Amino acid sequence: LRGLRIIAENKIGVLRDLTTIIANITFAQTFLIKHGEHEGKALIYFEIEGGDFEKILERVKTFDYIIEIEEEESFERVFGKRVIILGGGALVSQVAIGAISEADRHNLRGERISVDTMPVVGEEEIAEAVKAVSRLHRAEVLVLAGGIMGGKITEEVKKLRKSGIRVISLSMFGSVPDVADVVISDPVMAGTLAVMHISEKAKFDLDRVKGR
Amino acid sequence: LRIIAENKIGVLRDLTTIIAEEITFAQTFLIKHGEHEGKALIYFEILERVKTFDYIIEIEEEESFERVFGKRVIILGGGALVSQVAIGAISEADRHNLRGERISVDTMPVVGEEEIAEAVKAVSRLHRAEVLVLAGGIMGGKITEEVKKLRKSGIRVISLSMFGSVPDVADVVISDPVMAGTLAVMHISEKAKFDLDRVKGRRIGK
Numbered sequence A: 001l002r003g004l005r006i007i008a009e010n011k012i013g014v015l016r017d018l019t020t021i022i023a024n025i026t027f028a029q030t031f032l033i034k035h036g037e038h039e040g041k042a043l044i045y046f047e048i049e050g051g052d053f054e055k056i057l058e059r060v061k062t063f064d065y066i067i068e069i070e071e072e073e074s075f076e077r078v079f080g081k082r083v084i085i086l087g088g089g090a091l092v093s094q095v096a097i098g099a100i101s102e103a104d105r106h107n108l109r110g111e112r113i114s115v116d117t118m119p120v121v122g123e124e125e126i127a128e129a130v131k132a133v134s135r136l137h138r139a140e141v142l143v144l145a146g147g148i149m150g151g152k153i154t155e156e157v158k159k160l161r162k163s164g165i166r167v168i169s170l171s172m173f174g175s176v177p178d179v180a181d182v183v184i185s186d187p188v189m190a191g192t193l194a195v196m197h198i199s200e201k202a203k204f205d206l207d208r209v210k211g212r
Numbered sequence B: 001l002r003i004i005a006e007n008k009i010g011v012l013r014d015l016t017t018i019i020a021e022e023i024t025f026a027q028t029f030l031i032k033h034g035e036h037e038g039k040a041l042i043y044f045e046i047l048e049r050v051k052t053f054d055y056i057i058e059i060e061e062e063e064s065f066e067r068v069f070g071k072r073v074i075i076l077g078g079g080a081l082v083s084q085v086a087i088g089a090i091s092e093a094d095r096h097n098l099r100g101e102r103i104s105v106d107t108m109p110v111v112g113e114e115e116i117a118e119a120v121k122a123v124s125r126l127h128r129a130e131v132l133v134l135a136g137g138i139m140g141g142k143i144t145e146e147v148k149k150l151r152k153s154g155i156r157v158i159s160l161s162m163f164g165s166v167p168d169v170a171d172v173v174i175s176d177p178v179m180a181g182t183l184a185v186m187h188i189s190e191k192a193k194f195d196l197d198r199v200k201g202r203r204i205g206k
């Protein structure tokens, strides 16, 4: 697996020419640069394992719509696995304190773990965001921080189980706690546990503490 | 446009050709757990032309990360200070998200000149990132270099009042970490008039 950063002209087929020369892409992303020196150009990133990266390097350079090219470190190696926190501001921050603290110690030890958050409220809005976590790259655990959650949110929480995303809920009102993997009263501890569960370095696992 | 297909070699080579015939944003990765483990998750920002494929386990049009997660504030550095900035950023984003705006606060505790320098650099390839806040006690060397390059790509950088050369190359230096987080969010927010370009250089706090 190797990272490959690329900037090019926002043209049609540009991607197709690129996805052809690569004839193993484990990860791939592309978007239009919105600001800076290359606003309006396309940022193309591929993470390929196996093959002749060197050749494809040489082979793409030959394209007149190529601005920049360069290898990089996989997002897994720089930003790693992710803890997602959603809910009300204060509680989300409390959880973040614990998660960032725990991730700080773990990151020091080679593996990488980051804490991404977004304060959001409203049943449907929260439900929609919970659903979206399943489409997020490297997301592994979601912590729901709020005073009360249920309805659609509970449904999307049930559904997250089929994508393998773990869910930790605070001791809130509503039905969400029941469908979350575990309920934790203290928000800071909830944050530290989400990281501990993800971390290959910690022995803690959500599935090893059932039936307490 | 969402899709779940069999991770075959060069499957995007077919899809982008099918599309090149009839993409602002595009993302794809392998599901490494859950029901579709091993499969490949594909999302673009022809349903007929494509559905004519058997290796198409699914295909459901989604909102987009700019819709649900919006623009991002990235915070990097020492655990304690990153958290302090996050408290401010999360607080401000909470009020702003309450209306159309969608701003999320992404963070990662990291230390070491090169490790931090490398993370700063990677912010340029982060989708929807618009502001970076560096939180630490001392930062310089390669970090300062990557911060220079990072700003060339339109990303604004806020620095705490730390030691080292980093504060010298940042857009603004904020002494209070909580305030730094709120300002980072206010700058990104379309509902706030505050703009870091209107105060480039300036330092706020003891």
Ligand SMILES: O[C@@H]1[C@H](O)[C@H](O)CO[C@H]1O
Pocket (backbone or CB within 6 Å): A084, A085, A116, A117, A118, A136, B065, B069, B070, B071, B072, B104, B105, B106, B128
């Ligand atoms: O992509 C990230 C994740 O969705 C996080 O949970 C919130 O911020 C977004 O930018």
Ligand SMILES: O[C@@H]1[C@H](O)[C@H](O)CO[C@H]1O
Pocket (backbone or CB within 6 Å): A079, A080, A081, A082, A114, A115, A116, A138, B074, B075, B106, B107, B108, B126
């Ligand atoms: O994508 C997110 C952002 O880069 C965040 O700043 C750190 O964690 C990563 O997973």
Ligand SMILES: [Zn+2]
Pocket (backbone or CB within 6 Å): A196, A197, A198, A199, A200, A201, A202, A203, A204, A205
């Ligand atoms: Zn563990």
Ligand SMILES: [Zn+2]
Pocket (backbone or CB within 6 Å): B186, B187, B188, B189, B190, B191, B192, B193, B194, B195
């Ligand atoms: Zn603004």
